[PDB]
Write a protein that binds this ligand. Structure first.
Ligand SMILES: Nc1nc2c(ncn2[C@@H]2O[C@H](COP(=O)(O)OP(=O)(O)OP(=O)(O)O)[C@@H](O)[C@H]2O)c(=O)[nH]1
Ligand SMILES: [Mg+2]
Length: 167
């Protein structure tokens, strides 16, 4: 009944598509096929209401045309990989142009640190928690491989959109 337009953004290879495919199909895509742009719809129950989720899976390095889908989107899943410091530093550039394009400091957003199943972490959990708090947004650790945190990342974004509409 309620439609939510979600956009997954982040650097190349951080796991945007794998996180999206886990939510929708409950399988882990281990092969890496770089995305140009895919979108998916899923009906799911979150906190007792049926939600229609429109999920836009974006490309890491874009060709910019971010603005068109950044204006249509209501919530943004900002994804970095915990073994890629650069992808974590890229987060503030993603948030800056979302804020610019939507012309607001209060945009529904969730910070996602993906690939937490790997033993080669270079971005600490506390680092991300502090960046999240400085933005005033949730932070969720995930692994598309084991599916840990996957529903929570998307559902938490739904709830950030739900709060923004009910301010
Ligand atoms: N170990 C591990 N590998 C992961 C995880 N998530 C993604 N991968 C792998 O990392 C690679 C990149 O994953 P994608 O989901 O395709 O990357 P992306 O962010 O969609 O990348 P672009 O579409 O190119 O922007 C693939 O080989 C995935 O199988 C994870 O949680 N753990
Ligand atoms: Mg992809």
């Amino acid at each position: 009944m309620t439609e939510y337009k979600l956009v997954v953004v982040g650097a190349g290879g951080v796991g945007k598509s794998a996180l999206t495919i886990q939510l929708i199909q409950n399988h882990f895509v281990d092969e890496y096929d770089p995305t140009i742009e895919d979108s998916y719809r899923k009906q799911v129950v979150i906190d007792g209401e049926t939600c229609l989720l429109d999920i836009l899976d974006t490309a890491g390095h874009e060709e910019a045309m971010r603005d068109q889908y950044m204006r249509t989107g209501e919530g943004f899943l900002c994804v970095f990989a915990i073994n890629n410091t650069k992808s974590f530093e890229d987060i503030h550039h993603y948030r800056e142009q979302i804020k610019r394009v939507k012309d607001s400091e209060d945009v529904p957003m969730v910070l996602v640190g993906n690939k937490c199943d790997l033993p080669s972490r270079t971005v600490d959990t506390k680092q991300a928690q502090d960046l999240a708090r400085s933005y005033g947004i949730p932070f969720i650790e995930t692994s598309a491989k084991t599916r840990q945190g996957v529903d929570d990342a998307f559902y938490t974004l739904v709830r950030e959109i739900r709060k923004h509409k009910e301010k």
